[PDB]
Symmetry: C4
Amino acid sequence: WTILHYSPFKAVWDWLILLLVIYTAVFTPYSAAFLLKCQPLAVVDLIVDIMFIVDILINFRTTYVNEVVSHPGRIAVHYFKGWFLIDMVAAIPFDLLIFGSEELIGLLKTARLLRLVRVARKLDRYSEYGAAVLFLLMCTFALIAHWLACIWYAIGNMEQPHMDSRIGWLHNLGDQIGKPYNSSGLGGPSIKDKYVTALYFTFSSLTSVGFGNVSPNTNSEKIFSICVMLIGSLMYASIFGNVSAIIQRLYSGTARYHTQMLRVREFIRFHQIPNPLRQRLEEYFQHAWSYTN
Amino acid sequence: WTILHYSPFKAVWDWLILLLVIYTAVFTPYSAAFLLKCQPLAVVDLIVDIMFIVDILINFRTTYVNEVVSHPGRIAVHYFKGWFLIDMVAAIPFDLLIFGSEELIGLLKTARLLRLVRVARKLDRYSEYGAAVLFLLMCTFALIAHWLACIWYAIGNMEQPHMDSRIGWLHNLGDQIGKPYNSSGLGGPSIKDKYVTALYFTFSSLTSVGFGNVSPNTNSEKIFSICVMLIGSLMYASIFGNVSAIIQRLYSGTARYHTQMLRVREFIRFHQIPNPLRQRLEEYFQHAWSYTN
Amino acid sequence: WTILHYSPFKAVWDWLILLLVIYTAVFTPYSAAFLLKCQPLAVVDLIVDIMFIVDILINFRTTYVNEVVSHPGRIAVHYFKGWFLIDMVAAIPFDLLIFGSEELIGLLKTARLLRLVRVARKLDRYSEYGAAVLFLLMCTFALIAHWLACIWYAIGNMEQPHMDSRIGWLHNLGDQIGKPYNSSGLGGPSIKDKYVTALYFTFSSLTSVGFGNVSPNTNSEKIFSICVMLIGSLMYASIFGNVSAIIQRLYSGTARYHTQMLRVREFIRFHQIPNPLRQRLEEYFQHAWSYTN
Amino acid sequence: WTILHYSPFKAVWDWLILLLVIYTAVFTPYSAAFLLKCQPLAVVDLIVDIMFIVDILINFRTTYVNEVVSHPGRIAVHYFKGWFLIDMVAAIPFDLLIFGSEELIGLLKTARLLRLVRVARKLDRYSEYGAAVLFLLMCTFALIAHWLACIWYAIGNMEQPHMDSRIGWLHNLGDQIGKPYNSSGLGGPSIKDKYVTALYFTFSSLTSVGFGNVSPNTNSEKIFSICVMLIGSLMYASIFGNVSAIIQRLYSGTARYHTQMLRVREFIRFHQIPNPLRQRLEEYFQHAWSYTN
């Protein structure tokens, strides 16, 4: 057997894999930055890795446009010429492959971020609807804020063993919430306090609010903040350009309607059309527009 | 008898009900957030509830387009099979109906915010005039900034009995204005000091100024500011996109005029037209424009 | 004799009166806010009051379009039935007329801000040129920032005799620059330190930077800052909308050129035009473009 | 011999001189602000000054358009009646000419900033490609942010020997990073700490984040910040106006495609086309578009 790329199954499967790419893009950077020194986030990662492997089996059993191609030999050779290498590197079980330090095993699973390429391959499906691309733009924005929160925590944390003597953002967080770092390294804020503050700071830098209770203080935090300001400005010229243009695309029926209504009303005022005739003109435009848009 | 939906009474009544929906959108969230534990606002809420009940009787005695339907049975069944459920729920006298704690009696009146649906139903009347839709957009911005100020006060206040040990924004307000909270729970800022500071903080986060004397410090305050940064950026792509478009629509006569003027001016440069002829061309453009628009 | 409204004298006089309106819009708010309790600014104000009086005499001797009307009686009655009242109220010298406290005598000169109406009447002269309207938009922004600096200092100063007990922005300025107010009310920042700080805070609020060393702290300063954030957002939808649109209008030759060049380039790529013919097409486009625009 | 201005050598040379102008725009303002009183930045400046002299010899031996002109006498007189004066002043070795204080000798090398004119002459070469004009816009922004960081350090540094008594931004930097100044007016932050903080402050002001741990405190720092807020708002109305327009210009193939797809989709909904015909319509649109754009 072989699966048609326009079938109602393969359409729903491509929309389901988007949610497992969004899951990967959230929980992989978080586990790589915050959690490194059954669990639901161990077994759900195993379930999700099995589905990203089943998607390789579906890619060996899908038709594709050259006219459609429907022979398993002409399907398999096209997947090997195309994306199979990137898809297999995104599927190696590195957690089972080596036992080789635990820091390397924790970091190396960031190779799963190659699963973001399974969205770039399929924008011809996902971008078709205005309400779907507006959701992808807000998830692109919230994921870029989350990835920068994981980098901002990695920067804030790596300056404690290469010790600063109480300058970097984690010491200031400890004081501001009344959970200070003791000189033994004991105490300090929880992973919720550190994550929520890092996400708050990077939405505050990207959306340009800059609240000034978290503020960058060491040179690596300042050089990171210059990079977040260069990313945030290119992104506001692009994402919140396209969200405004997509709202204007949905609103385009109303914008055209009021433009043609204003022309009809201005014509009616310029000629001072008598009421017995004017009502026939301004009712006809509403009828004709309601039929043909 | 029956009322025609285009009549000058029903037109003025639908513009009066916009001002009473704006009153409900202001003083209901304020009473639910700041005033929990006759007065002028206790009698004015009774007068306004009577007018929102009179508006239900008008909705049983108004015509609608199938042209118009003008039989009370065909009117009433259309209202029951439409908006009557929301309209009557938005008029239940919960201030009298139960005796059942006084906090819940005060909170349950927030069901009156269903009166905002009486504006969404009538955007065919309200959006027609450029100065009226520009007014609505500035009131949607000011009402969202006010509703967020009521949530920001509810968050800042509920963390005092869920005691924080002096971390949340109301303790910082007490120390900043020289009206501290005593350790006995006495003193602290007045309702004007707390409301004006809450409204100042939500305009500061929405317009992205971020003044840094009020800043979010506990995790619920930081999670709220992440939500206000997402609301504020979607609202700047939408409201201050549409306000700039309506400003350009009011400017459209001037924009067309200068665009046609530049074509005529460049034509007169390109052919180097002699003055006696140039004045005839360039005066004719001003007549033909100021006559025909 | 009588003066033609299109003459080179009346063109230069209308462009000179713009500079004396810009002078009035600067030095009247400043003298009313900062300098209350002959000099160079007193004699320049007298010279400028004489020129705004001479402009009333020119308005009694200028032609106007009904063809142009040139009889002095038909000119004078048209000016009296028009702007003469506002032009005379903007010219009555209340300072020289009076013989009742000197605070009111200094404040009453703010009637000179009616001279801003002598710009709004003449936008058909001033808005014609792209470099002139871009200058008017930047001076409208810099004058709105200056008028708000004068209101912000009037608020900050009135709360010292209506005493705050050391809360408002002037006490914090004293501590920050090392010029504290003494306990007797003696000393404190100079008029330069106070003005440059008030102008800095209002550019910081309007452009939304919010630097957080000056921040609003009493309720009148917070209510003013809410007003500046509503002014600043409507103004960024309008002024920095129109400045960007005028920059696009100045760029419109280059924008049309690249749009037609991209069409000709895309056509040449699609048909794979051989080089001997490619150069002829691609040069002819540049000749036809640079000749006719 | 003589060089044709469209040849692949002269194309590569004009793209190489853009990189040496970008190097000049970085390392000359930096050396003039931070380093006042062979190694890499002595020998690389010698190599680059020799290449800007070799470019003068190329400018005497290149063809130009009046139709092309190729006689060395008609080339040389066109360069002498054109840019040769600016190109010679941008190449005088003032460091070898004078032997009178060394502060002026170091500052006088800022004459090399006339090399920015060698980019402004050649925008007809560089602006042709959409990726190249987007790169020039981001480097124009990052170079304005760098030049303002050199002025901001010159202001912050000159008020230490013209002593402030502990007010300006460099004293605050020393206290924040754990490197306080000695009472002699000496020691404290390194050139990395001072440069990275100055560049962080000008991106913070230009992108309007305003982080509030660096803030202007003396009057020269406040007057500078008012100028940066006027430059930053004109620049965001112009540079990030153009970057968002260039992103929409690159996206114009997709924007035209989806607008034409939506017109076809709306037509197919309006007539309710049966599936055996509908597929042929929407498949033909995809063929016709992917063939001709």
